[PDB]
Design a protein around this ligand. Structure first.
Ligand SMILES: *[C@@H]1O[C@H](CO)[C@@H](O[C@@H]2O[C@H](CO)[C@@H](O[C@@H]3O[C@H](CO[C@H]4O[C@H](CO[C@H]5O[C@H](CO)[C@@H](O)[C@H](O)[C@@H]5O[C@H]5O[C@H](CO)[C@@H](O)[C@H](O)[C@@H]5O)[C@@H](O)[C@H](O[C@H]5O[C@H](CO)[C@@H](O)[C@H](O)[C@@H]5O)[C@@H]4O)[C@@H](O)[C@H](O[C@H]4O[C@H](CO)[C@@H](O)[C@H](O)[C@@H]4O[C@@H]4O[C@H](CO)[C@@H](O)[C@H](O)[C@@H]4O[C@@H]4O[C@H](CO)[C@@H](O)[C@H](O)[C@@H]4O)[C@@H]3O)[C@H](O)[C@H]2NC(C)=O)[C@H](O)[C@H]1NC(C)=O
Ligand SMILES: CCCCCCCC/C=C/CCCCCCCC(=O)O[C@H](COC(=O)CCCCCCCCCCCCCCC)COP(=O)([O-])OCC[N+](C)(C)C
Ligand SMILES: CCCCCCCC(=O)OC[C@H](COP(=O)(O)O[C@@H]1[C@H](O)[C@H](O)[C@@H](OP(=O)(O)O)[C@H](OP(=O)(O)O)[C@H]1O)OC(=O)CCCCCCC
Ligand SMILES: CCCCCCCC(=O)OC[C@H](COP(=O)(O)O[C@@H]1[C@H](O)[C@H](O)[C@@H](OP(=O)(O)O)[C@H](OP(=O)(O)O)[C@H]1O)OC(=O)CCCCCCC
Ligand SMILES: *[C@@H]1O[C@H](CO)[C@@H](O[C@@H]2O[C@H](CO)[C@@H](O)[C@H](O)[C@H]2NC(C)=O)[C@H](O)[C@H]1NC(C)=O
Ligand SMILES: CCOC(=O)c1cncn1[C@H](C)c1ccccc1
Ligand SMILES: CCOC(=O)c1cncn1[C@H](C)c1ccccc1
Ligand SMILES: [Cl-]
Ligand SMILES: [Cl-]
Ligand SMILES: [Cl-]
Lengths: 340, 349, 332, 349, 340
């Protein structure tokens, strides 16, 4: 048994040239790929990337490795991969990645009698995706993973998804705390550079951000502060200290709400959907404070000289008691219909 | 397969990869071009930036001439470690990565005349010294210098593969900038002098202009609204002493918080940026509103405001402060004029 | 040396590319684990750190030898000379063996071919946490390991009698959690490359409540009690009660963001979120209570609303606390 | 020159670095000492500390005796990989660093009798379990345990080079501690029992006392000033309801910020520290001063203060509250007494 | 000619013993050192370290490497450095360092006909320097690089700066945003341990901190808040709500200035120069608030029962309008003269 297997495996590597791909100087070698996704984590808008753990299996035929007389698929110790040709697959958008190495290098080489090689790697890769945050936190991102051959063109190597649409598994078991993976899809194409045309496999996910976290942390605190700025409409116009303190505090609170949200995001130059709401709530609490200044100026600035009446101080307060809750509801009605 | 194995074995038989091609006869000439797959984020605090490149080099090695069934030998990267390759390094680089997932991202191609093509995927983090006087309306030319580490210009020289402007190519979709616009790149060549000789340097300058949108939303607009808020108190009656004092004190406290929090992402430079000047003038307007009211309060004769019933002839009541009436115009007007001057000054630089 | 001769004879003709019994039977590997410490639980990343002495025992008939010496006690030098199983941890986010001052590995070979292989590991293991009951939550964080390449027809793992041993738990770096107990299981997981024997250890963890009582519950409770001081302040003090009412709401907003700062941005409502939100309702209603009282008395039984609020508000917060604490401490 | 090459060639010819010296004949004895070149920062959050050492080990190996024109061979650390060395590991060691710049920071010396000296430069990160019930007035004994990973006490035993106290030496200028003092070290040895046998373990405890100065400045003083600020309102007239309400609310909210900001240094332990008790009592004093004013306001009849002219006949005017007069004395006295008891409780112990 | 170079180099490394230093068993080998400092950055008070990038050149003569017949200085591929003896140079205060490795290891080997070796390395090192922050931010720091031989004593090796004071270049071109390098100093000495005396080269920089940043961040806000607190002295004694709110907020605003400054610095057990100012400015705003409570107590407490007069509140307020600005300038005069 083991004498024959050891004799056979030694025979395969004797005279093997790792510098030459299978069918070197001939037809392209076809490499099929399966990805089993272990997890997705650290989807960072700050860093514009996501971290992916996966089992990255590659399949190809090397007729130099065909063996006979052994009705077995030979799973060899993974160090034999240093003695064999393997595809020079790389991830174009991969910022940082490693093959896990405990307790050994998380790598698998399985030979088959006809010369087929199954080569699996356990890889954690931090791949870059640039996120369009104009609809944040109601945004829907699309993060990919480009898979390409570095030095071998379509004349030397061909990529395909093994199993077609079933080539990637484990997507339905991924739990992202902030997202739900709406869809994933698989793309095969060629990419042209100045050095040749290279086969590319593309795996992309569509992440829809969950909104429940931002209701509790940003939207409900803003609505309650905006509502509490309307309390000044029922306070007597004489109580200037009370209404200014109520007015100033809500304007201050809106900034404090915005700063907490501001500090956990990149410095994108455009206005996000969350900024539109916070700016909207700021306008409402600012106008409420300006409403008392108008009430104060009408009574004291113009009183001695002697649509709301604009001369009756209590008429302006009665008008504001209706318009501000109505308009804010109208603002929330428009904002949520546009973004949900 | 033995045909190509015998060719590779013959090439490496008696080959000394410690010796550069032409060592003792001529200068090795390395043609270089760069394909930028992504111009990564710029870090103001570290005064650096990230760039992802296909770094391509090409040189002639007469020891690697061959005749065979093919005119180009497309080999895996492990052949590159068997031959001589240039020792190129980035002069302003900080912590660069030569990616090797899942294998070393390198390609080596040998043509029958000995010409070698040698490209590698690199992530370079390079220094970009910044002058932040005009921040956040500033522009920078981030350099990317490289050359041989050990070989002087009498041994190794670098040249651009094509027209120098066309030898650095940025991908259409390859932009990881969040707050900058890549306006283009200027490509040059030069000679640097060290303690070990004269070296050829290949230089690329990436011209970046900062996008002001974030700082308008997070700093300029809150400052402008605080200044407008501080001037609301000019329209309150002079007898609302607790009310107008809260206006003045709170707005100063807000300006202090804005001023302190506005340099978080910047290096602690010793000069004033354009934003520091804006916050200073906004602080001055906010501070002067509280000084304005304290002057108004100093001439309030009576502690009670107008009751809304008694006629005021010309008991007695305080009159509307003349300082308030002038402040209701002068303060909004001087701040509008300052913004016109401030924005025309820096948006035109 | 006689040990040198034995070691050289064992490795002569040995092919460490081949698993023992490669075409005969599966290799049975007995695993032990000594837990040096279960490090911090990182809720934000959904992970925990564990430091283990990981022991594996199998039989390699190619390593049999006859001599008066009954066992070869070896360091890490020979670990790469013989065959070693490709055990890996399936939920490991990041793991590292130890290399100071030398590779922390042990190899012992007995004359009947039994091999004992031990090494020291630090593992950042993935642990998905359901934080609905936070900060009164309980978790069973797994640690799965299997063979990377050898299926169930080639490698089978098997827990020994003393499967997992834990030392002085008091030295562990479990700040917010208490270790309750562990279970070790065995199962076969079907992947695309075959069926694999997967061994799991589950570490039951209960969150200690003290930090969040100090950090969140007491501050939020005191701000709620602070808002009740307004009910005893004269209703004519409009600036006093309006400033008191509105600053508590501003403070309760600041406490809300601090409470969730240590959590992943999960989109469901934890027990902490419920307490903070209800405390928000109490401070919000106190300000509305005075606004209603001020409008109906000055800006004009309702006039006696302060007397009612002096009792109803403390009683409703006590009642909410009674329901909140009973449900999350004894109920589901 | 070749004279010493032949000695080294002879030493390694037939040498088996898989076997410890004296195997099957005696117990290998390893002499050990540590020179601490710096005692790095202590991390409360990770409950660990850093320490940079020269880890010196010495043992006898008869296979390495030689006769030559030198008595000691001061060899390149490349030689140490060719011979058996102890497999010492730190039992409570976390991620530690073997320094490799610019070369492996190791020395190997062989004397003619076979004795080996083998030292290395290591950055050791070791676990230090902490009991923070007395924080910020806590003291710790941070352990450093090491021994053979693979060899039981019947195979390898460790001893200190000199007297145990003198075998761990800290450099005079090496203190990298910021909030601790290195009072001294205790050096001991023992046996640890595992499932694989009995192992010699060498123990050193470094005794660290936290320096309270940072927390006096940043936590205790702001708490004390806040409590003192809240008792100022006892001296304002009882009719300044908005003024005395701001006093109470501001100080209560300030203590809330102080309490939350106080534990940012510590790991999130589930028990109360000495700092938590001080802040809790400071919270009670601040909260009671506001509750005191509410009681004062509950007995305040008239909404107007004394007009400064009318004589109070001991319209009518409110009297100065007896609660206010009593609180002017009781609150400073009780808080002064609490500070005396609190500091004597923890500073003395 | 190129074959002659290949033959000559092969002859040098044939029989070469990398385990033995030059002149093994004889006089110590003298190693000369140059440094071209590429940059200094990340001078961290939190971590008590600075990061230094340099071209680190070592110069020594190895007679085993002398070659004749080639009138050239052989620059060889840097991988030949692993076949030659090089000094075991290390940095004692080095916390984390690396030789740059893109595109190849940034390492230079240049042989010379008489056997001289030039060995260059591009190194980024994070060295430790404990900083005395008692005068921070008006402080000068002294941060060093300690270069030493690990295994070779002064009997085996001698270090010297090659070029004297011109051994280290590029210091004058270093630009740090927060510091200005006042001077750099080169020291050569011996350090004794239990294992023998070892050569040491010390490169030290004296760093002076630029204060322009801290004027904008800490001092000016503190000065303005303190000036703001004096506005209370121009408000009538009976306006308790105004003066208390003004006094309370300035006391709080001083805390806000301090907490932001505290968060960016290590846990330092002593009082820094910046702490003395903030605590000085805190006393002034606290006394200004205590001035009103005293004024309120005189009028309302001691009023009905019947240096300023201490019985007229107007006199106390007018006395405060002069003394408080005057004393604060006196405090600024003493502070800035002592720390400059
Ligand atoms: C992309 O590129 C990167 C590089 O840019 C690449 O990373 C490299 O990956 C390779 C593997 O593919 C690594 O190489 C192996 O590393 C093994 C250990 O790895 C751990 O330790 C690393 C540091 O090791 C030092 O210390 C140990 C002891 O503590 C020592 O054994 C090492 O030689 C080395 O010592 C040098 O440095 C120290 C200072 O650090 C000096 O003090 C010392 O003097 C010496 O100069 C550490 O870097 C690793 O961390 C990395 O990897 C982990 C994952 O593993 C990851 O989590 C981290 O984040 C980090 O990335 C890790 O902790 C090492 O055992 C291997 O060496 C074997 O095999 C080689 C084969 O050529 C042989 O030459 C060696 O002698 C040794 O032989 C073994 O040794 C075993 C242990 O003793 C023993 O059981 C065996 O029996 C055999 O023993 C000897 O055998 C010889 C014959 O071979 C015989 O003569 C003897 O008598 C004896 O029997 C090997 O070096 C490499 O370290 C990685 N480099 C870096 C920088 O990370 C990455 O993989 C690439 N990716 C892809 C996808 O391609
Ligand atoms: C209503 C009334 C209410 C009344 C209530 C009364 C309640 C009263 C409650 C009082 C409680 C006081 C508790 C104090 C505990 C101190 C413990 C201790 O040892 O601390 C030390 C100080 O540590 C430090 O960091 C020093 C801090 C300096 C602070 C300067 C303030 C300047 C003020 C200016 C004011 C000007 C005013 C001007 C006015 C015109 C710790 O350090 P160490 O261990 O000693 O050091 C050991 C190491 N070395 C250095 C020796 C080598
Ligand atoms: C730090 C700087 C300090 C500067 C201090 C400068 C202070 C200063 O000059 O005050 C004078 C006056 C006060 O203005 P204001 O209208 O508030 O005060 C009225 C003024 O005092 C009248 O004289 C009073 O009438 P009378 O005759 O007593 O019956 C009147 O009494 P009553 O109607 O209430 O009964 C007061 O209300 O202001 C100016 O003239 C504005 C100049 C341009 C101001 C431009 C500001 C931009
Ligand atoms: C937590 C709940 C605590 C509840 C505490 C409840 C404490 C409690 O019940 O106090 C009542 C009393 C209030 O005294 P205080 O001086 O504040 O109030 C005066 C008192 O009510 C007189 O009786 C009134 O005169 P009169 O006779 O109407 O003419 C006088 O009116 P006027 O002359 O101004 O017009 C009031 O100002 O306090 C003490 O005696 C202090 C003892 C120490 C009390 C210490 C309390 C902390
Ligand atoms: C871990 O697994 C082992 C089995 O591999 C469990 O040990 C068994 O415990 C039951 C208890 O009823 C005994 O009947 C068996 O004989 C044991 N098997 C042995 C000793 O091989 C052990 O209980 C498990 N540990 C857990 C679940 O914590
Ligand atoms: C006219 C709109 O101004 C504002 O909304 C505004 C001005 N100062 C502050 N804010 C708000 C809080 C804000 C700032 C930044 C982002 C989102 C929201
Ligand atoms: C009288 C001394 O008290 C204070 O300075 C004091 C009390 N609360 C706050 N502060 C100030 C802001 C401070 C604290 C710590 C460092 C620097 C400055
Ligand atoms: Cl950017
Ligand atoms: Cl924890
Ligand atoms: Cl410390």
């Amino acid at each position: 048994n083991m004498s024959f297997v050891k004799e056979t495996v030694d025979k395969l590597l004797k005279g093997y040239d790792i510098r030459l791909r299978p069918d070197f100087g001939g037809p392209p070698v076809c490499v099929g790929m399966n990805i089993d996704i272990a997890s997705i984590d650290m989807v960072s808008e700050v860093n514009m990337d996501y971290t992916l753990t996966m089992y990255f299996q590659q399949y190809w035929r090397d007729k130099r490795l065909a063996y006979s007389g052994i009705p077995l698929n030979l799973t060899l110790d993974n160090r034999v991969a240093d003695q064999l040709w393997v595809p020079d697959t790389y991830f174009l958008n991969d910022k940082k990645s490693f093959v896990h190495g405990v307790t050994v290098k998380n790598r698998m080489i399985r030979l088959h009698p006809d010369g087929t090689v199954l080569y699996g790697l356990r890889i954690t890769t931090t791949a870059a995706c640039m996120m369009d945050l104009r609809r944040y936190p109601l945004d829907e991102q699309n993060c990919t993973l480009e898979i390409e051959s570095y030095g071998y063109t379509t004349d030397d190597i061909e990529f395909y998804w093994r199993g077609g649409d079933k080539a990637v598994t484990g997507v339905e078991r991924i739990e992202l705390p902030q997202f739900s993976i709406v869809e994933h899809r698989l793309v095969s194409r060629n990419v042209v550079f100045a050095t040749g045309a290279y086969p590319r496999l593309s795996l992309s996910f569509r992440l829809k951000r969950n909104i429940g976290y931002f209701i509790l942390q940003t939207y409900m605190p803003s609505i309650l502060i905006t509502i509490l700025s309307w309390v000044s409409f029922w306070i007597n116009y004489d109580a200037s200290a009370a209404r200014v303190a109520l007015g100033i505090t809500t304007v201050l609170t809106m900034t404090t709400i915005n700063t907490h949200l501001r500090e956990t995001l990149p410095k994108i130059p455009y206005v996000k959907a969350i900024d539109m709401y916070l700016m909207g709530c700021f306008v409402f609490v600012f106008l409420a404070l300006l409403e008392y200044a108008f009430v104060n100026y009408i009574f004291f600035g113009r009183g001695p000289q002697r649509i709301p009446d604009l001369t009756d101080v209590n008429a302006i307060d009665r008008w504001s008691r209706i318009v501000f809750p109505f308009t804010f509801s109208l603002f929330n009605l428009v904002y949520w219909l546009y973004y949900v | 397969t033995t045909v190509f194995t015998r060719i590779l074995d013959r090439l490496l038989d008696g080959y000394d990869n410690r010796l550069r091609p032409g060592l003792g006869e001529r200068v090795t000439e390395v043609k270089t071009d760069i394909f930028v797959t992504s111009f990564g984020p710029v870090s103001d605090h570290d005064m650096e930036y990230t760039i992802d490149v296909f770094f391509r080099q090409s040189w002639k090695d007469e020891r690697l001439k061959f005749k065979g069934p093919m005119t180009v030998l497309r080999l895996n990267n492990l052949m590159a470690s068997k031959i001589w390759t240039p020792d190129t390094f980035f002069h302003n680089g900080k912590k660069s990565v030569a990616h090797n997932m899942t294998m070393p991202n390198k390609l080596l191609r040998i043509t029958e005349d000995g010409t070698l093509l040698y490209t590698m995927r690199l992530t370079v983090r390079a220094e970009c010294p910044m002058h932040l006087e005009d921040f956040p309306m500033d522009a920078h030319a981030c350099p990317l210098k490289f050359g041989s580490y050990a070989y002087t210009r009498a041994e190794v020289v670098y040249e651009w593969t094509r027209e120098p402007a066309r030898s650095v190519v940025v991908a259409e979709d390859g932009s990881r900038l969040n707050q900058y616009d890549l306006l283009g790149q200027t490509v040059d060549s030069g000679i640097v002098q060290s303690s070990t000789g004269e070296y050829v340097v290949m230089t690329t300058h990436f011209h970046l202009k900062r996008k002001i949108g974030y700082f308008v939303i997070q700093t300029y607009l809150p400052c402008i609204m605080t200044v407008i808020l501080s001037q609301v108190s000019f329209w309150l009656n002079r007898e609302s002493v607790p009310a107008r004092t809260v206006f003045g004190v709170t707005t100063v406290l807000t300006m202090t918080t804005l001023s302190i929090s506005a340099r978080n992402s910047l290096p602690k430079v010793a000069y004033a940026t354009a934003m520091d000047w804006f916050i200073a003038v906004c602080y001055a307007f906010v501070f002067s509103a509280l000084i304005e009211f304290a002057t108004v309060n100093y001439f309030t004769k009576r502690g009670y405001a107008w009751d809304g019933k008694s006629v005021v002839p010309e008991k007695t009541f305080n009159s509307v402060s003349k300082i308030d009436r002038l402040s209701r115009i002068a303060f909004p007007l001087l701040f509008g004029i300052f913004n016109l001057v401030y924005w025309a000054t820096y948006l035109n630089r | 040396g006689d040990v040198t001769v034995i070691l050289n004879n064992l490795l002569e003709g040995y092919d460490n590319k081949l698993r023992p019994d490669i075409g005969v039977k599966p290799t049975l590997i007995h695993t032990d684990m000594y837990v040096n410490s279960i490090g911090p639980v990182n809720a934000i990343n959904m992970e925990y750190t564990i430091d283990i002495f990981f022991a594996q025992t199998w039989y390699d008939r190619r390593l049999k030898f006859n001599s008066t010496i009954k066992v070869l006690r070896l360091n890490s030098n020979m670990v790469g000379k013989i065959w070693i199983p490709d055990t890996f941890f399936r939920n490991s986010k990041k793991a590292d063996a130890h290399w100071i001052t030398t590779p922390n590995r042990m190899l012992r070979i007995w004359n009947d071919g039994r091999v004992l292989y031990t090494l020291r590991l630090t593992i950042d293991a993935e642990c998905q946490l359901q934080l609905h009951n936070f900060p009164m939550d309980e978790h069973s964080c797994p640690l799965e390991f299997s063979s990377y390449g050898y299926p169930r027809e080639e490698i089978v793992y098997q827990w020994k009698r003393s499967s997992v041993e834990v030392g002085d738990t008091r030295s562990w770096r479990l700040y917010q959690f208490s270790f309750v107990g562990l279970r070790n299981t065995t199962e076969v997981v079907k992947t695309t490359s075959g069926d694999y024997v997967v061994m799991s250890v589950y570490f039951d963890l209960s969150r200690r409540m003290g930090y969040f009582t100090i950090q969140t519950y007491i501050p939020c409770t005191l701000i709620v009690v602070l808002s009740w001081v307004s009910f005893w302040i004269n209703k004519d003090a409009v600036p006093a009660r309006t400033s008191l009412g509105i600053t508590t709401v501003l403070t309760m907003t600041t406490l809300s963001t601090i409470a969730r700062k240590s959590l992943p941005k999960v989109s469901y409502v934890t027990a902490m979120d419920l307490f903070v939100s209800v405390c928000f309702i109490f401070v919000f209603s106190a300000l509305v209570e005075y606004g209603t009282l001020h409008y109906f008395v000055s800006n004009r039984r309702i006039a006696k609303m302060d007397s009612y609020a002096r009792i109803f508000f403390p009683t409703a917060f006590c009642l909410f606390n009674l329901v909140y604490w009973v449900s999350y401490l004894y109920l589901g």
